[PDB]
Design a protein around this ligand. Structure first.
Ligand code: HEM
Ligand SMILES: Cc1csc(C)[n+]1C
Length: 291
């Protein structure tokens, strides 16, 4: 496969900035979801799960085809709970029927991070919806019950190296795990709907205790009321990953700069951009626009 980026016919920066402004205004408004966490966390988890099916060996999966819209990917056990992020974005797709599904699912993630006080993420338009038979089979998304060796081997299929993997995993400060979705339960820190380096600081400063939860799965619990997954806890058990965790814990700006670069790379894997294509757009936040 080659997947060439094609701009939605006739659309420019200001059209996309209107879809972003509409996702951000609805984030402001539906602030009660999941005990007042808001939809920001499930929207960046939707943007990474539609991108994480990519396989570098044959160019299949990835964000291009917007295939989550199909039953097979939608009903994938690893995608339980993302139906909430889909339902949120659906009125917005009726308001802007011209934007592709992959472009909308991925911009939902960019909007959520920037509106949660994260770094600016450059975003590129051009994904094209593809047929139901291009939909990737289930089982390409990662297990939580595993170690640092599995994590490194997994992220190599998306050719993400160590620093990219540690920066990307910093998004687990956001939101929480839910027992009925994944068999895990609990938050990862205090500020779980503001984007900060808190995941790293909690992983270095809490007194973590291994326990089984109500689903019979193990997780790392702390006195404070926080939890970490086995794969999260892996980042301080591996010596290469641990020097990077310490770097981000001492420097949130370096974390922002590296998360920005890696999240964009994750959203654009498997897509060729012609050089006639527009440069990546930097969207303004509501606040920047006075809205
Ligand atoms: C080895 C990698 C990863 C594994 C095994 C993993 C696993 C999980 C699991 C089990 C949950 C809880 C789901 C639930 O019960 O609702 C979760 C939540 C979440 N994940 Fe990951 N994750 C990984 C990588 C990432 C990456 C790379 C991102 C983002 C760049 C990400 C973002 C999120 C977000 C934001 C949540 C919170 C969702 C919410 O509050 O509803 N994860 N993850
Ligand atoms: C720590 C962690 C891993 S997945 C998730 C949601 N949290 C809060």
């Amino acid at each position: 496969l080659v997947h060439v980026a094609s701009v939605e016919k006739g659309r420019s920066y200001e059209d996309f900035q209107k879809v972003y402004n509409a996702i951000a205004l609805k984030l402001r408004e539906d602030d009660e979801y999941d005990n007042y966490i808001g939809y920001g966390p499930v929207l960046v988890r939707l943007a990474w799960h539609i991108s994480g099916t990519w396989d570098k060996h044959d160019n299949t999966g990835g964000s291009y085809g917007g295939t989550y819209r199909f039953k097979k990917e939608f009903n994938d056990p690893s995608n339980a709970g993302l139906q909430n992020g889909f339902k949120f974005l659906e009125p917005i797709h009726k308001e802007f029927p011209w934007i592709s599904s992959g472009d909308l699912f991925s911009l939902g993630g960019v909007t959520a991070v920037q509106e949660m006080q994260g770094p600016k993420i450059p975003w590129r338009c051009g994904r094209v919806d593809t047929p139901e038979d291009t939909t990737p089979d289930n089982g390409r998304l990662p297990d939580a019950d595993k170690d640092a060796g599995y994590v490194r081997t997994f992220f190599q299929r998306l050719n993400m190296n160590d620093r990219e993997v540690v920066a990307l995993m910093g998004a687990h400060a956001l939101g929480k795990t839910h027992l009925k979705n994944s068999g895990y339960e609990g938050p990862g820190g205090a500020a779980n709907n503001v984007f900060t380096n808190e995941f790293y600081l909690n992983l270095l400063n809490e007194d973590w205790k291994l326990e089984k939860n109500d689903a019979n799965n193990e997780q790392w619990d702390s006195k404070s009321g926080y939890m970490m997954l086995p794969t999260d806890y892996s980042l301080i058990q591996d010596p290469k990953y641990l020097s990077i965790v310490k770097e981000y814990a001492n420097d949130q700006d370096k974390f922002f700069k590296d998360f920005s670069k890696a999240f964009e790379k994750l959203l654009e894997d498997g897509i060729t951009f012609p050089k006639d294509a527009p440069s990546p757009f930097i969207f303004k936040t509501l606040e920047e626009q006075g809205l």
